[PDB]
Design a protein around this nucleic acid. Structure first.
Ligand code: ZN
Ligand code: ZN
Ligand code: ZN
Ligand code: ZN
Length: 121
DNA sequence: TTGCAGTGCCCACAGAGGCCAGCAGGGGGCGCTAGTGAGGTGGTTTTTATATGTTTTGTTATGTATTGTTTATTTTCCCTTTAATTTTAGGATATGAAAACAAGAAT
């Protein structure tokens, strides 16, 4: 485990994908990459029978599509609710990240440093 | 009624941001095995140790040989007394040698 861990600092990727440029830190990530070229798909969502490449994708599918009463995530800055955490990530990166050079209002001279305040104005 | 100045509405293509699969990042827990590492047991020999038999060493007793001891028969040194043995006259013998006599021979 520690031998495998040290590549997280160094960056060694001693496992090459013979069919593309990808290179993984350990055996499992390479075996998981192989399904995309071979097209093998061992796992199956038992409810809708929709097809997926990856187990975790299926688990998130079940959680968002065939599950009830699941907790959501509220943006701290704005008042909108959205389902997935990673989409809350992309929301904070595209709308509430600090914009260095600023953006000016289309109709007045006021300049803003966050896209949210701009759209709100 | 119209031209002009200003408004309403409908569309649409952009723009935007949540939705979504895909995919890669670090880390937790299991399936299985090669390869030593060490520890324990068994076998082997072996080595120390012990006991028995044989022989070697030490001690004891008997016989032989050596040294000493008072006899003890030589033996040998020293007397006084004879028994040959020697020496010195003294008389007698003998054998010689002159001496006298007698006998040839010569002058
Ligand atoms: Zn590849
Ligand atoms: Zn499903
Ligand atoms: Zn927000
Ligand atoms: Zn403005």
């Amino acid at each position: 485990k520690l031998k495998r861990h040290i590549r997280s600092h160094t960056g060694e990727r001693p496992f090459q994908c013979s069919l593309c440029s990808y290179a993984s830190r350990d055996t499992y990530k390479l075996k998981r990459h192989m399904r995309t070229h071979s097209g093998e798909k061992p796992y199956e969502c038992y409810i809708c029978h929709a097809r997926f490449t990856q187990s975790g994708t299926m688990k998130m599918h079940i959680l968002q599509k065939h599950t009830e009463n699941v907790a959501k995530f509220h943006c701290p800055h704005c008042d909108t609710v959205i389902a997935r955490k990673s989409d809350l990530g992309v929301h904070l990166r595209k709308q509430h990240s600090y914009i260095e050079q600023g953006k000016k209002c289309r109709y007045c001279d006021a300049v803003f440093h966050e896209r949210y305040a701009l759209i709100q104005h």
